[model samples]
Target: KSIDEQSLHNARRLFESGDIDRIEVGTTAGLQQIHRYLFGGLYDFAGQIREDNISKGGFRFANAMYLKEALVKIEQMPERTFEEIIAKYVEMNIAHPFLEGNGRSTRIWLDLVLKKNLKKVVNWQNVSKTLYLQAMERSPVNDLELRFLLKDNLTDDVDNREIIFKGIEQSYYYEGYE
Candidate 1:
């Protein structure tokens, strides 16, 4: 398997091994742990917040200076429902705390938060890459595109490893870059 495939496989193994605690759901610290577990041995910068600003396709992410505070705000979000939790997910995406692997790591983090708070997780395979990426791009500007998309896509199903694999594959290697 390729490195991305290997990384996703290893992450799936770790995820299914019951290693992470439920208490580490929605904090910067939790996200660091998720990143570390997902890409630790593969990257020296794993688990660390980016110290520099980065962008793609002319979209600027949240400044690194506010990353910690932004994370704190995300952690404080009320995860009472799918919409509530996904709002936090959108906010975290805007924060874009990591230099690499943010997309995959955040997907896992979102699932964990949902599982712990709502007793349910999203079936990411149901979400299309085009819709997700477009929603993400529009989210930073006070748009609810991502939230609405996720709201309609969430499912009560859990333990769907295929969905996890598909979600990672699409995010990591899909070739529709503009």
Candidate 2:
């Protein structure tokens, strides 16, 4: 499948731009970048249209660019007192952004994005993949499982906040990612 060059370029623009605080993370601007590159920009950015865009876009090879954008948004968040950041992250998974690698990439990027805004990273050493999967399973229909995971795993808001900051320690002041 051929990728959409324009979408890729636009996404790059969003990523490179420093005004993320002004825009919503999962807006057309952000997903256009990921969708254009990941799934050839064949799928509709908007949900459900008159025609089954999915019918033309091969459902099996679908892309969940929305989830990716949500991750980016979570990364850009300033901070909220006593907020369940992980709950927000799990809710994001429902967007189901890609035909492949959505789970793994989300897991890894969750850390990177959180590192950007929250200034801390989720420690997977204590993370239960089974619980994560369980959370994912229920996420499609209910949020209870994910809520449990966040409550169980991420308890220290201040310390958890540091994951984003400390994780970015290697990144230069001039660059968010190094």
Candidate 3:
């Protein structure tokens, strides 16, 4: 199967098992697990930080050497409010810890934290891929755009959490590396 098709399948299996929900958000280990679960056998480097640097457009991500420290700092951030949660998400995106699947995996990580702290998840189904990508691209400079996008799309639906997992690439990797 194609990479996208295979990825979606794996994501569905992982999400349906309710395993992603159990992940401890805002940690390097949690991010690695999400990556490994979503893209394990498909990528040898799954669950590991990228060794090489990665960049897109004019955006340079966190250096691989600092990924550990960076993630540790992110994990230490406060998540008592939705603003803090979104701030943490943007920080993770800027870190770009993995070689691939950072966007999709991070979204899952973000939602887990959101659910835990705010009892809400960004309804990926409610937002268009175009708008999501636009906001994500600007998130590094300031997360206001992405924050507003997610805030407006928030939902508490507990039945079809699978929908959030299925549209894995809808708002991810439109122009980024890998």
Candidate 4:
């Protein structure tokens, strides 16, 4: 009955039904699609970009005034290598486009980008949640911590169902979802 409970189910259903394959990667549209898939029915904002500026942990997310224009440039950023991909990912973190579930949804988006471009995804099972959050919190300044944490956990088994599902739980857990 809870929104996140239902949204979790929606995320599972995405891969279960093979719809995850249809999502575009390394683009703002793709990120929006993922967010909508995960939370469409649960939240009115779902895939819609946030109109209000917001922040957490003393950091401000993008101002709505410039976010639309900013995301256009983010979508154009190259993701050709581990370094490039992480840079783009950090930009998304700074973008923080949605009203809720940005962390959870964007992890899925990140994995998809890695999978499509490099045939790998981070093994979130091996990732430390505290370290990850800390890395992310520090990312807007420097991405070395975030990059190292994720790079060390890379795996090529992108299509393994159980592995993928477990990553989702772990990803959600990163934001205290479970």
Candidate 5:
């Protein structure tokens, strides 16, 4: 929920005051930019989990840092297509932002980011709890079954808001496990 002051403030400056003119679609750089603002406080664990640190109980810190990076990454890739955007979402889900509440908060953040980018709405109605659990069990694989299920349920005609609301309402995807 809360970010460390210094890094987050810098990221906010980059987001609100900087020019995003050269950002291209389908690029990791764009996502990195967004991660700075949205998840700035935690910006270390970008790709792989550190086994030694985690075994020593540093995973919590690792998760926090990674969330910041993911948030920054989200911003830079604002122009991504639906599938690509979903991939980023999957990446964040696996990154695990905090020691607790990661599922709920991350899902919420996913909605906000997608809504801003899509300029429409999302309705994640009809989410399956069973399938969502399966997805969570598979989180280490960097898969986002929950998000995709919600995404699949929506009508192509619906806007991002509808899709996102439906998504948040589903207990299956936001079970707060991973």
Candidate 6:
């Protein structure tokens, strides 16, 4: 595979150009917009809703047949509190809407929701890879671990550039993106 840095660079631009502010927060469209922008030329299914089912670490993602329904339901979930926001974030994890690169884009989407609703954002710079990888494995049924980690790491300096890209790097860590 090509070790192209274009997608990663574009992700940086999504913030550097102040365009991340324009992405519709707390919606599926916003998530996809991030997905599309990051992988536009790198993937065939970049922004499109995946047509097939997928999995990770022995768990299945949305049932492709009912995925559309699930996402609609999830979008309706509230984002008013740390509990509510993390709750919806867990649901988004289950949906895992995209095929290849959901983590980074979705994390970006999550940040927007937090900044818009609570004036805070998860500081990925302070997060560890295993805690996240292990936390989400059980998040669908129990978000306590996931919630605890994020809640403990929330920050109000939403404009911190290092936090944004560093958080993204942690997201990409699991995906093996350089």
Expressed as tens digits, the lDDT of each residue in 1-178 for candidate 6 is 2533677788888899998888998888888899998899899998888879999877999988898888898988999998999889889989999888888788888899999999999998788888988898989879989988888999999998888888777767756765
lDDT of 1: 0.76
Error of 4 at 27 (Å): 0.8
Among residues 3 or more apart in sequence or in different chains, the pairs in candidate 1 whose N, CA or C atoms overlap within 3 Å are: none
Every model's TM-score: 0.85, 0.41, 0.89, 0.97, 0.47, 0.95
Give the per-residue lDDT digits (tens) of candidate 2, residues 1-178: 1233443333344334533234433232443333333334445432221121121122221134344555456445433421444555554454445443244334434543454455555554455555766666666457687656554554234344344333222211111222
How does model 6 score by TM-score? 0.95
* Candidate 5 CA-lDDT value: 0.46
lDDT, candidate 4, 16-86, per-residue tens: 99999999988899999999999987889989999999999989998999999999999899878999999
Candidate 3, which segments miss by more than 4 Å at Cα? 161-178
Query: Which of the numbered candidates is closest to the native, going by highest TM-score?
Result: 4
lDDT of 5 by residue, 1-178 (tens): 2333443344334424533233333333443444434344464533222333221122223344355665566445443566656666666555553433344444445544555567433454565667765765554455567556656654444334444334444632344311
For candidate 1, the 10 contiguous residues with the lowest summed lDDT are 169-178
Error of 1 at 80 (Å): 1.4
lDDT (0 to 1) per candidate: 0.76, 0.41, 0.78, 0.91, 0.46, 0.86
Q: Write the per-residue lDDT of candidate 1 for residues 1-178, one digit (tens) a residue.
A: 3547667766766657767554287778898888888788887899999999999777888889887887788778888877778788888888889998888788878988888887777666677778888888887775478777777766666667676666556655433311
Worst 10 residues of 6 by lDDT: 1-10
Which scores better on TM-score, 4 or 6?
Answer: 4
Model with the higher lDDT, candidate 1 or 6: 6
**Residue 115, candidate 1: how far off, in angstroms?**
1.5
Ranking by TM-score: 4, 6, 3, 1, 5, 2
